[PDB]
Swiss-Prot record:
Membrane topology, Extracellular segments: 71-78, 302-318, 377-379
Full-sequence range covered: 569 to 834 of 1212
Job of this protein: G-protein coupled receptor for glutamate. Ligand binding causes a conformation change that triggers signaling via guanine nucleotide-binding proteins (G proteins) and modulates the activity of down-stream effectors. Signaling activates a phosphatidylinositol-calcium second messenger system and generates a calcium-activated chloride current. Plays an important role in the regulation of synaptic plasticity and the modulation of the neural network activity.
Coiled coil stretches, renumbered: none
Domain of life assignment: Eukaryota
UniProt record similarity statement: Belongs to the G-protein coupled receptor 3 family.
A GO MF label: neurotransmitter receptor activity involved in regulation of postsynaptic cytosolic calcium ion concentration
Quaternary assembly: The PPXXF motif binds HOMER1, HOMER2 and HOMER3. Interacts with SIAH1, RYR1, RYR2, ITPR1, SHANK1, SHANK3 and TAMALIN. Interacts with NCDN. Isoform 2 interacts with NECAB2. Interacts with CAMK2A.
Residues with glycosylation annotation: 315
Predominant place of localization: membrane
UniProt name for this protein: Metabotropic glutamate receptor 5
Keywords: Cell membrane, Disulfide bond, G-protein coupled receptor, Glycoprotein, Membrane, Methylation, Phosphoprotein, Receptor, Signal, Transducer, Transmembrane, Transmembrane helix
Length: 415
């Protein structure tokens, strides 16, 4: 009848879900108006604002589902229940997986440049060899094993590549091996206090130049260029260029040092030799249309109907929940994969950090939703609270920090 009547009767649940949904709707409208009024601010215009609007619409639909699950005895409401509870997480996570996939592609294309730089400078061997220390190595100085068995080296190489290599790889396989080495080198940099301040206060190209220097001499040797590192930190490229040209490393390996110094100076890859926007909308549209087609197919197979109360009970069985839940869970898994592969990306004021934390919480909440909902005797209220909680964790972990930066730190809103 009425949630207030159920509160007066002794059930403090329907009116609570209504208040939750109303607060969520008000918060979604607040965040949307903030992001529209401040569309040209660098914090908003740096991400996919259209995909952000798609995610906001998903959150709003997830909150509106409570008014469908707690409504009057009507048929269109039994339809809109399934539509909303299937499309809200779909609408959010399709845009989210598009964003995370584009971020992962950007990261791969960024590492490709360092691979090309150190292929030009250091070199590469597609067959297994031994380093000067006498240990099995292949590619751009990638250690296979410290053990003295060529068969063990080939075993670890096959285990790392995933194919019967027989001691021979390709350039892309060598790039895959080189990505782990550059990750380890960056970790070694961020742990030394004589290299981390410069590394964090640089752009990508100069970070790559410093990585090349570390690959050539080591972190302890690169830490010797104290004055030049401080010049680079203070964005004094023209002076650091000369001070590096005065070095003994420049006189021992001049050809590579010239390119590294020119890279440090100009900030471009000119010294060496080396995803659309409307496409993301269409991809998210297709991913949402797949879920909508699932929903329509279940409408045709199992037509909605009132079973037969403030709860509009419908004939929604378990399959009509399992299939959309399954597709949304696959979306969540892909989202989590691509957001974990990009967890340390600092773009958009470290947006991927909050994205990854939100994806972790969503995975946990859904893994808990399965046995809680399916082993429950109050399924409508649990569905209400679960959808509202997922929308809430999304809106709070992803959009609340941005609105906080906009409406409280207007000076940090700079590229
Ligand atoms: C920071 C701003 C405040 C945020 C918290 C707002 C809290 C709102 C909570 C619910 C309001 C009261 C619910 C209405 C009770 C209905 C019972 C009746 O009217 O008879
Ligand atoms: C009446 C339902 C609740 C209305 C409050 C929520 C309003 C925002 C809803 C979803 C955000 C995405 C929809 C609009 C996108 C931005 C509009 C635009 O840029 O033209
Ligand atoms: C501050 C935000 C919350 C303010 C209090 C809002 C709670 C009371 C509002 C009305 C709830 C009506 C919900 C509609 C469901 C009843 C329809 C039905 O049961 O058939
Ligand atoms: C970007 C995603 C936009 C999604 C917004 C909401 C989606 C609503 C889409 C159309 C609903 C049509 C459902 C079919 C009607 C019932 C008839 C039937 O299936 O037999």
């Amino acid at each position: 009848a009425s949630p207030v009547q159920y509160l007066r009767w002794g059930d403090p649940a329907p009116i609570a879900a209504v208040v939750f949904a109303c607060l969520g709707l008000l918060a979604t409208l607040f965040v949307t108006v903030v992001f529209i009024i401040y569309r040209d601010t660098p914090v908003v215009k740096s991400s996919s604002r259209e995909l952000c609007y798609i995610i906001l619409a998903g959150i709003c639909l997830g909150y509106l589902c409570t008014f469908c699950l707690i409504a009057k005895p009507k048929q269109i409401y039994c339809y809109l229940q399934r539509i909303g509870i299937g499309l809200s997480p779909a609408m959010s996570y399709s845009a989210l997986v598009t964003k995370t996939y584009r971020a992962a592609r950007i990261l791969a294309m960024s590492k490709k440049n360092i691979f090309e730089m150190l292929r030009i400078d250091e070199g590469l061997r597609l067959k297994i060899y031994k380093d000067t220390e006498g240990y099995y190595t292949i590619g751009i100085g990638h250690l296979l094993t410290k053990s003295p068995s060529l068969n063990a080296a080939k075993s670890e190489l096959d285990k790392a590549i995933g194919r019967n290599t027989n001691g021979v790889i390709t350039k892309d396989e060598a790039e895959k091996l080189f990505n782990q080495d550059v990750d380890a080198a960056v970790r070694g940099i961020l742990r030394n206090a004589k290299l981390k301040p410069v590394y964090d206060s640089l752009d990508a190209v100069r970070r790559a130049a410093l990585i090349n220097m570390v690959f050539q001499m080591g972190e302890t040797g690169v830490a010797g260029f104290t004055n030049s590192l401080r010049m680079l930190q203070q964005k004094r490229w023209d002076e650091a260029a000369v001070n590096l040209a005065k070095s003994r490393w420049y006189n021992q390996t001049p050809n590579r040092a010239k390119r590294v110094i020119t890279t440090f100076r100009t900030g471009t890859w000119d010294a060496y030799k080396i995803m659309s926007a409307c496409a993301q909308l269409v991809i998210a549209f297709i991913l949402i249309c797949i879920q909508l087609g699932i929903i329509v197919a279940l409408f045709i197979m199992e037509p909605p109907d009132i079973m037969h109360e403030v709860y509009l009970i419908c004939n929604t069985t378990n399959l009509g929940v399992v299939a959309p839940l399954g597709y949304n869970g696959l979306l969540i898994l892909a989202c989590t994969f691509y957001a974990f592969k990009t967890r340390n990306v600092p773009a958009n004021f470290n947006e991927a950090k909050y994205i990854a934390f939100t994806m972790y919480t969503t995975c946990i909440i859904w893994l808990a939703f399965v046995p809680i909902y399916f082993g429950s005797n109050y399924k409508i209220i649990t569905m209400c609270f679960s959808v509202s909680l997922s929308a809430t964790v999304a809106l709070g972990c992803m959009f609340v920090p941005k609105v906080y930066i906009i409406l409280a730190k207007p000076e940090r809103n700079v590229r």
